[PDB]
Curated annotation (Swiss-Prot):
<dbReference type="GO" id="GO:0051701">
    <property type="term" value="P:biological process involved in interaction with host"/>
</dbReference>
<feature type="binding site">
    <location>
        <position position="34"/>
    </location>
    <ligand>
        <name>1D-myo-inositol 2-(L-cysteinylamino)-2-deoxy-alpha-D-glucopyranoside</name>
    </ligand>
</feature>
<keyword id="KW-0677">Repeat</keyword>
<keyword id="KW-0012">Acyltransferase</keyword>
<feature type="binding site">
    <location>
        <begin position="227"/>
        <end position="229"/>
    </location>
    <ligand>
        <name>acetyl-CoA 2</name>
    </ligand>
</feature>
<dbReference type="GO" id="GO:0008999">
    <property type="term" value="F:protein-N-terminal-alanine acetyltransferase activity"/>
</dbReference>
<feature type="binding site">
    <location>
        <position position="174"/>
    </location>
    <ligand>
        <name>1D-myo-inositol 2-(L-cysteinylamino)-2-deoxy-alpha-D-glucopyranoside</name>
    </ligand>
</feature>
<feature type="binding site">
    <location>
        <position position="223"/>
    </location>
    <ligand>
        <name>1D-myo-inositol 2-(L-cysteinylamino)-2-deoxy-alpha-D-glucopyranoside</name>
    </ligand>
</feature>
<feature type="binding site">
    <location>
        <position position="213"/>
    </location>
    <ligand>
        <name>1D-myo-inositol 2-(L-cysteinylamino)-2-deoxy-alpha-D-glucopyranoside</name>
    </ligand>
</feature>
<dbReference type="InterPro" id="IPR017813">
    <property type="entry name" value="Mycothiol_AcTrfase"/>
</dbReference>
<dbReference type="GO" id="GO:0071468">
    <property type="term" value="P:cellular response to acidic pH"/>
</dbReference>
<dbReference type="GO" id="GO:0035447">
    <property type="term" value="F:mycothiol synthase activity"/>
</dbReference>
<dbReference type="GO" id="GO:0070301">
    <property type="term" value="P:cellular response to hydrogen peroxide"/>
</dbReference>
<feature type="domain" description="N-acetyltransferase 1">
    <location>
        <begin position="2"/>
        <end position="136"/>
    </location>
</feature>
<dbReference type="InterPro" id="IPR000182">
    <property type="entry name" value="GNAT_dom"/>
</dbReference>
<feature type="binding site">
    <location>
        <begin position="234"/>
        <end position="240"/>
    </location>
    <ligand>
        <name>acetyl-CoA 2</name>
    </ligand>
</feature>
<feature type="binding site">
    <location>
        <position position="262"/>
    </location>
    <ligand>
        <name>1D-myo-inositol 2-(L-cysteinylamino)-2-deoxy-alpha-D-glucopyranoside</name>
    </ligand>
</feature>
Amino acid sequence: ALDWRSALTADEQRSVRALVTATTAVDGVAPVGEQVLRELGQQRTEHLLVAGSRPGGPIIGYLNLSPPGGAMAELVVHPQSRRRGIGTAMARAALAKTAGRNQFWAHGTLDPARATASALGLVGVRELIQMRRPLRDIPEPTIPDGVVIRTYAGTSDDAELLRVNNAAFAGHPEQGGWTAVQLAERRGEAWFDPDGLILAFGDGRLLGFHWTKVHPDHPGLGEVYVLGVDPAAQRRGLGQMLTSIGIVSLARRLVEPAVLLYVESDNVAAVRTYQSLGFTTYSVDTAYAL
Ligand SMILES: CC(=O)SCCNC(=O)CCNC(=O)[C@H](O)C(C)(C)COP(=O)(O)OP(=O)(O)OC[C@H]1O[C@@H](n2cnc3c(N)ncnc32)[C@H](O)[C@@H]1OP(=O)(O)O
Ligand SMILES: CC(=O)SCCNC(=O)CCNC(=O)[C@H](O)C(C)(C)COP(=O)(O)OP(=O)(O)OC[C@H]1O[C@@H](n2cnc3c(N)ncnc32)[C@H](O)[C@@H]1OP(=O)(O)O
């Protein structure tokens, strides 16, 4: 009988991290994301832990349900305990609990998840594509005159940065409607580098920005973290230009070494921008729902 938990002891947390680590080693992709792992020590989400057969042992299944749209579930069954109905049981428990509204993330959209989705009568409703390109044979930026490029100068630039971010991402669930609070939270992370946030200004109002990211724990990789062009300055080549400039900067600072990004599969403009600069699909995360 699956018991929804709102909190976990230190041992239980260690048992879930062990299950996740064991699974990544076999599957080659982590089964739940980094934020799920940060939620293990908090009381903000709900969890299912499926214990093994004998006392004193490791767990064999885990599901996290994060509140919102519908809630989002991430789950994992140990490679050695698959094809025994555990994933199906935890998934049906989440659907019953959320009235059939929650979604499920499948990192890497691996064969088992696709089949399990099929078996549960779910369909893919979102695809988040991770694209990558090598740090070699990189593009050259074309800077149109009437535009000047420089890096972020601190809080002096925040008003414009939020204005542009919020105009470009207007109506976007998570990236739109930002405030100084979101900026401060990110500037507070160890990976932040003000010189990695590139800005293009008219020659002037901010026209667009490309926030790049190098994480200390993933050597040799750079990320196009947020790219946004004010709609008043879109369709003039700035988005590509900014992405190019960021690749140059990351390649200077830095499987194979590379620049990666995550983009919604139906974001036509961004996908085209990235395709023009040589990015290709590396992996896809599919959100499954009824
Ligand atoms: C919709 C989702 O599951 S999103 C889940 C995202 N999580 C992951 O991808 C993490 C890595 N994968 C896992 O942890 C597991 O493989 C899970 C959670 C996807 C499935 O866990 P399991 O406990 O093996 O699922 P379960 O035993 O209930 O399988 C249900 C049915 O789906 C199918 N299925 C599951 N895995 C496979 C597979 N590798 N190949 C073919 N069919 C499969 C079968 O029809 C199966 O029943 P059957 O064994 O009687 O034929
Ligand atoms: C990793 C991430 O940041 S994913 C999130 C990306 N950012 C967003 O979704 C924010 C909202 N969108 C935007 O800010 C912009 O549309 C951007 C940044 C994606 C592109 O900015 P732009 O300045 O318009 O880019 P640019 O003028 O160089 O055009 C690049 C390509 O997109 C295409 N494009 C631009 N706007 C559109 C549009 N409205 N419809 C269809 N295609 C478009 C261009 O035709 C061009 O295609 P091509 O590469 O095949 O030549």
